[PDB]
Design a protein around this ligand. Structure first.
Ligand code: HEM
Ligand code: HEM
Ligand SMILES: N#Cc1ccc(CCNCc2ccc3ccc(N)nc3c2)cc1
Ligand SMILES: N#Cc1ccc(CCNCc2ccc3ccc(N)nc3c2)cc1
Ligand SMILES: C[C@H](O)[C@H](O)[C@H]1CNc2nc(N)[nH]c(=O)c2N1
Ligand SMILES: C[C@H](O)[C@H](O)[C@H]1CNc2nc(N)[nH]c(=O)c2N1
Ligand SMILES: [Zn+2]
Lengths: 407, 411
């Protein structure tokens, strides 16, 4: 019941007690581990509120205070009357930071306490949402000196008045299916790119077209908005040794801003809560650029390097993968946009784990997601045992709004 | 209860029914996943169901389930258990058992080969010298002058746990490690503890960077004895790089035959505590882990210097760059010397096919993603994108404590 985790490179052992706080379920059982599976009312509401307020008031050293009981009382009365309740600004901020803190798949969590929270609960319209989102983007981008941020739209009520951002990220490239049978642009976004077209977007049908925003307010139908291009910071990708690399025509955007997740705090659900930090290089260089069902550029790059692609054993894919990832880091650094390599990031996370075990009693971590998609065992996290479990407040996945939406 | 796994690169969806035949525990609960944890004297009471379960499986596989020979065998085993407190496996059952233990090894990427396994029955063995002889033969057969053949040699099963056969080496062939007075380590740091034991037992260490360890063999619960594998049986490969001529001067080599000797083989409730087995290497085992783990030979820096990479910033990915060339060199050297080896692309691609085949013919394939995914270039291999389900089937290979921690010394 008190669990130990070992780092096999350093022999450092940490003891986990935080997992006993855990509430939600993992998908695993005594008979079967599902560690690699991608996706495993008033009476309900009050204990959830209570649990949250308990940890909030504990966090500020007023556990068992009059203010605690008063707030508990006040929220309790409000649930009985209104069937929901509203978070104080302080509670909202604490909740959002802690959702990030609890995100077991996030390697960047050492930054968790430095998050700018934008309260957009006064928003009533998609135009309003757009304004809030442009402000988020400009603030977080900060001319390339990225600052982590979250914008929080009104909470779910009866689920027929949901605020949703239909985009998966605020900034993403379109995907079009060709008559050639192939795919131009980002294959991951073909379906959404269609829905933008079905709703009226004029696609430029290019390789790297910034998608328009599809914004849903108060359960109404979604609307299109173009992010001012001046607010979309992008980085042309060159290699510091290969002059021909610039001719590949690649670029990426500086701001990773996930917009389709569900934020849960004290039993309350925020279905529209776009957040942003900054990239780890492998996200673009390894996954975005080299995944087969994505931009899939390995072959072309390999050819330009004139590698022996006859046999897999030449490790040409591995060679190319490295150089591509060099270029990404080099380009972002050269243009002064915040980015972190997989070595620096995983090393930070180890320090963060140690901080969390020391100061909190543990840290939930999904090894399958924390270990980078390249050079796994030369990063310290590979050798680090981790315990995965679900703490609240949390970020959760939710269905895509088109499968749900009653038009 | 049906269970679906998804490949997110191909959208291929597979349905697992095999997990229903699972008994052993994962270490996981509904409240916690221990998927990345490295490591999460039996009574006749608990022994017969295990025998029956095994024999039921065996006789199904040969399509004689419920036959008179099936029934008689259960009867025979039953009586032999209640008379002698244990039972002996037929040769056929032993072979079936060994192959299925490999087939069930969720952490093994090489399982496409599971049905090709040369089983050596060493259950008539009684002494350490006898173990040495069996092991020498295993090494010669499996090596086959570079054309490696998978094999396992199986020594007598545990009885009262006081007469265990154990091979004290973690692998039949492995390099010594020597801790120096200055804190540095000469040779393989992973083997410092075992090296020290050998030396204590009388081994005269050459004290070099690549000294092949002696065998330390324990028969029938007696104190272990030292033997030297004939050098002419130990196939080694000098590591050079196809374009970098200085790479040879690093002085690296490795042995050809990966042969794990410290695991426990469970078949029908019986425990085989000495069952060394061997296949062939995936390149990354040597080029990534053995050479590049900070706690192993740790050659990244010296290699990086020789390539003249920017080693001042990690964001140059000098480590990633040097890792690739080293792994190229390992593969190149083995292929050049015609010693069997497989790259991580080939191996993982084969595993996917094996896994799909297992789902179709067997109803599932238990697999440990954390272990199956190679330690470099993870997502450019197809296994990264494959959801897997991990669970325990018997027969199986299990870990067991190191014998020096448990052994009762005779003197
Ligand atoms: C500031 C620098 C940050 C870095 C370097 C970073 C790094 C990462 C990386 C590499 C992943 C894996 C994502 C993937 O492979 O698709 C991830 C996941 C995640 N991150 Fe972070 N992150 C940062 C900031 C943030 C912030 C500000 C939040 C929220 C407030 C956050 C919440 C999450 C969540 C919930 C996941 C899980 C993603 C999922 O389940 O789909 N991260 N992070
Ligand atoms: C024929 C070529 C083979 C290849 C390429 C191969 C590949 C591998 C690799 C790369 C690992 C991971 C080991 C590590 O990283 O420490 C592994 C694990 C394992 N293999 Fe295979 N293998 C082969 C044959 C065999 C055979 C013949 C057996 C037994 C009859 C076997 C049983 C196992 C078991 C039980 C593990 C788990 C290791 C552990 O838990 O420590 N493999 N294999
Ligand atoms: N199909 C699919 C499919 C693929 C990936 C994911 C998870 C994507 N998470 C992206 C994500 C989330 C948060 C992040 C925070 C920071 C950062 N640099 N990248 C981040 C990236 C889900 C479904
Ligand atoms: N400390 C430690 C520690 C390090 C490694 C392991 C597991 C090692 N597994 C080695 C292993 C086992 C079976 C194999 C089969 C074939 C092959 N090529 N390599 C194989 C390699 C456990 C504890
Ligand atoms: C099948 C497997 O769960 C899937 O490919 C996971 C593996 N680990 C990952 N890790 C990160 N960081 N991001 C991912 O998308 C994935 N995908
Ligand atoms: C802590 C973690 O489970 C440990 O480093 C594992 C990770 N995956 C592995 N995978 C393989 N094949 N071999 C290993 O030794 C390990 N080590
Ligand atoms: Zn699990």
């Amino acid at each position: 019941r008190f669990l130990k985790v070992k780092n096999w490179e350093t022999d450092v052992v940490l003891t986990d007690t935080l997992h006993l706080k855990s509430t939600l379920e993992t998908g695993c059982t005594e008979h079967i581990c599902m560690g690699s599976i991608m996706l495993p009312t008033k009476d309900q509401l009050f204990p959830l509120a209570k649990e949250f307020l308990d940890q909030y008031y504990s966090s500020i050293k007023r556990f068992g205070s009059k203010a605690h009981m008063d707030r508990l009382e006040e929220v309790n009365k409000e649930i009985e009357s209104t069937s929901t309740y509203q978070l104080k600004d302080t509670e909202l901020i604490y909740g959002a930071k802690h959702a990030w803190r609890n995100a077991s798949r996030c390697v960047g969590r050492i930054q968790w306490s430095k998050l700018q929270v934008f309260d957009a609960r006064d928003c009533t319209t998609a135009h309003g949402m757009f304004n809030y989102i442009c402000n988020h983007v400009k603030y977080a981008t900060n001319k390339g000196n990225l600052r982590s941020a979250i914008t929080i739209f009104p909470q779910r009520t009866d689920g027929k008045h949901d605020f949703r951002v239909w985009n998966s990220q605020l900034i993403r490239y379109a995907g079009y299916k060709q008559p050639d049978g192939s795919t131009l642009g980002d294959p991951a976004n073909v379906q959404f790119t269609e829905i933008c077209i079905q709703q009226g977007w004029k696609a430029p049908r290019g390789r790297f077209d910034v998608l328009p925003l599809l914004l849903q307010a108060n359960g109404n139908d979604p609307e299109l908005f173009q992010i001012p291009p001046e607010l979309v910071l992008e980085v042309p990708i060159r290699h510091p040794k290969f002059d021909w690399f610039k001719d590949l025509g690649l670029k990426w955007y500086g701001l990773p801003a996930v917009s389709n997740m569900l934020l849960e705090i004290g039993g309350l659900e925020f279905s529209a809560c776009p957040f942003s930090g900054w990239y780890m290089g492998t996200e673009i260089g390894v996954r975005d650029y080299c995944d087969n069902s994505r931009y899939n550029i390995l072959e072309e790059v390999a050819k330009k390097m004139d590698l022996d692609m006859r046999k897999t054993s030449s490790l040409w894919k591995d060679q190319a993968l490295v150089e591509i990832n060099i270029a990404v880091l080099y380009s972002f650094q050269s243009d002064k946009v915040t980015i972190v390599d997989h070595h620096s990031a995983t090393e930070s996370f180890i320090k963060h784990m140690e901080n969390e075990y020391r100061c909190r009693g543990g840290c939930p971590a999904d090894w399958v997601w924390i270990v980078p998609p390249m050079s796994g065992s030369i990063t310290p996290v590979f050798h680090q045992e981790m315990l995965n479990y679900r703490l609240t407040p949390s970020f959760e996945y939710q269905p895509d709004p088109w499968n749900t939406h009653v038009w």
